[PDB]
Design an enzyme around this catalytic site. Structure first.
Site, PDB file in Angstrom:
ATOM      1  N   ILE A  22      42.714  54.084  33.684  1.00 33.67           N
ATOM      2  CA  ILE A  22      41.692  53.722  34.676  1.00 33.67           C
ATOM      3  C   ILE A  22      42.372  53.466  36.024  1.00 33.67           C
ATOM      4  CG2 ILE A  22      39.816  52.166  35.294  1.00 33.67           C
ATOM      5  CD1 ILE A  22      40.448  51.061  32.211  1.00 33.67           C
ATOM      6  N   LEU A  52      49.970  50.396  35.221  1.00 34.95           N
ATOM      7  CA  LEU A  52      48.920  51.173  34.569  1.00 34.95           C
ATOM      8  C   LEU A  52      48.025  50.320  33.626  1.00 34.95           C
ATOM      9  N   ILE A  53      46.724  50.612  33.684  1.00 32.70           N
ATOM     10  CA  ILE A  53      45.725  50.011  32.812  1.00 32.70           C
ATOM     11  C   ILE A  53      44.990  51.127  32.063  1.00 32.70           C
ATOM     12  CG2 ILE A  53      43.905  49.907  34.569  1.00 32.70           C
ATOM     13  CD1 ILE A  53      43.503  46.915  33.212  1.00 32.70           C
ATOM     14  N   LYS A  88      47.249  46.768  29.433  1.00 31.81           N
ATOM     15  CA  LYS A  88      48.017  46.790  30.665  1.00 31.81           C
ATOM     16  C   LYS A  88      49.484  47.051  30.323  1.00 31.81           C
ATOM     17  CE  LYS A  88      47.524  44.156  34.929  1.00 31.81           C
ATOM     18  NZ  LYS A  88      46.881  42.990  35.618  1.00 31.81           N
ATOM     19  N   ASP A 119      46.787  33.412  44.117  1.00 29.44           N
ATOM     20  CA  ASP A 119      46.377  34.637  44.757  1.00 29.44           C
ATOM     21  C   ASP A 119      44.886  34.948  44.591  1.00 29.44           C
ATOM     22  OD1 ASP A 119      46.854  36.873  46.449  1.00 29.44           O
ATOM     23  OD2 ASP A 119      47.474  38.094  44.780  1.00 29.44           O
TER      24      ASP A 119
END
Ligand code: MG
Length: 309
Positions: free
Chosen positions: A21, A22-23, A41, A145
């Site tokens: 979609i 790294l994921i 993930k 964040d």
């Protein structure tokens, strides 16, 4: 990584990778694809994923989250659930992976004109973020964040909002031992410069107040379409002095910044409260939430309508 690759987590569950979609989408090898409520993930063993991994393993436990939700009478808590993690081999190289609950689109992608949201939505988002902060703070963690790009709508319930990306997360009180206050200008100005706390600007280890502070700057930004330090983002010291001036000039600094159709009275008082906190002081989460909802209106659906824009 190819789709179909089976990963083995530390618990010994097996997961099959879906499309990136790294994921990646993930499926348990036991259940059918129709019921796909997971993502995996993946990163090398080279940092922020391991930082996220320590957070999710220690805090994102289904049963504790369930009991907290029941006790505190929450409709939900915006923490994605953790399912497992481990290592996989690609060539000679090892990769770390983490299986989490699948979620939807981020709020930066779905924001209205100039990265704004409707005032009711801004205030609800802050209340939902306060519930998450109380949970993570109680479990020894700060996020560091908070921003629209790190707020995600649900997948299974698309109407719920989640706080994601614990890559800058910090354990501020390991086993009850709160970190000491030390300015370190060699570790100065980490975070997203627009939103980062003054403690972050000073190189001070993040504590609970920093997350409340960041959330205030976020709500201000979401409601008003900009922050006073918008033109100064490539100068982190200028940003620091601007935020210091904003907090020193409360409540009027914030009250005056608002457009005529969206009052900042709630955000002004929220930041007055946030600014009163000592370094190791517990935020009064209930008071902050009442500040954001001074008329005790039940929380409706999140309104992301861009009608007219
Ligand atoms: Mg440095």
């Amino acid at each position: 990584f190819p789709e179909g690759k089976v990963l083995d987590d530390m618990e010994g569950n097996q997961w099959v990778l879906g499309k990136k979609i790294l994921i990646y989408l993930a499926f348990p090898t036991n259940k059918p694809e129709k019921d796909a409520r997971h993502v995996v993930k993946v990163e090398y063993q080279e940092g922020p994923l391991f930082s996220e991994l320590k957070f999710y393993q220690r805090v994102a436990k289904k049963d504790c989250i369930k009991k907290w939700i029941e006790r505190k009478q929450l409709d939900y808590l915006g923490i994605p659930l953790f399912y497992g993690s481990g290592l996989t081999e690609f060539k000679g190289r090892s990769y770390r992976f983490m299986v989490m609950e699948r979620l939807g689109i981020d709020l930066q992608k779905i924001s209205g004109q100039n990265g704004t949201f409707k005032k009711s939505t801004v205030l609800q988002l802050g209340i939902r973020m306060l519930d998450v902060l109380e949970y993570i703070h109680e479990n020894e963690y700060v996020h560091g964040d908070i921003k629209a790009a790190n707020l995600l709508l649900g997948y299974k319930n698309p109407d719920q909002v989640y706080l994601a990306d614990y890559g800058l997360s910090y354990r501020y009180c390991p086993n009850g031992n709160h970190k000491q206050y030390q300015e370190n200008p060699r570790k100065g100005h980490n975070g997203t410069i627009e939103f980062t706390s003054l403690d972050a600007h000073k190189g001070v280890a993040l504590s609970r107040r920093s997350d409340v502070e960041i959330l205030g700057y976020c709500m201000l930004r979401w409601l008003c379409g900009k922050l006073p330090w918008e033109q100064n983002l490539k100068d982190p010291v200028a940003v620091q002095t601007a935020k210091t001036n904003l907090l020193d000039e409360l409540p009027q600094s914030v009250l005056k910044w608002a457009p005529s159709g969206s009052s900042c009275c709630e955000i002004a008082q929220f930041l007055v409260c946030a600014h009163s906190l000592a370094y190791d002081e517990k935020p009064n989460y209930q008071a902050l939430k009442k500040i954001l909802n001074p008329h005790g209106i039940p929380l409706g659906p999140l309104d992301f309508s861009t009608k007219g824009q």
